[PDB]
Amino acid sequence: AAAQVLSSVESEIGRTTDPVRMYMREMGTVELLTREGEIDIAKRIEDGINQVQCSVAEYPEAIT
């Protein structure tokens, strides 16, 4: 519900212009993900590029 915080605070931001606050407020939205985010995201990347290397079969087009 971090975008909801953006909603209210932006609703009464004190005419802020510093991008520092903006960037930190934005990156603080998405929280950390630890001890399985690493592995399951790697296995999703596995799934993607190995779906690719499966796609890499059978090229009459790319005969080279």
Binding site: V5, S8, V9, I13, T16, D18, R21, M22, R25
Partner: protein
């Protein structure tokens, strides 16, 4: 009559508004505003009278 215009009832909203005036644009977190309030006046390092 000033109390009659006092919007708050709790400690926490007052602390929020203080944190707000001194750090606009950021959202509130309790311990931040608390340590801020106490260090402005009750920390020996950030305040001295001579």
């Amino acid at each position: 009559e000033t109390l009659r215009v006092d919007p708050t009832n709790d400690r926490l909203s007052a602390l929020v508004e203080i944190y707000r005036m001194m750090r606009p644009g950021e959202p509130p977190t309790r311990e931040a505003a608390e340590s801020l309030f106490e260090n402005l006046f009750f920390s020996e390092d950030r305040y001295d009278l001579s």
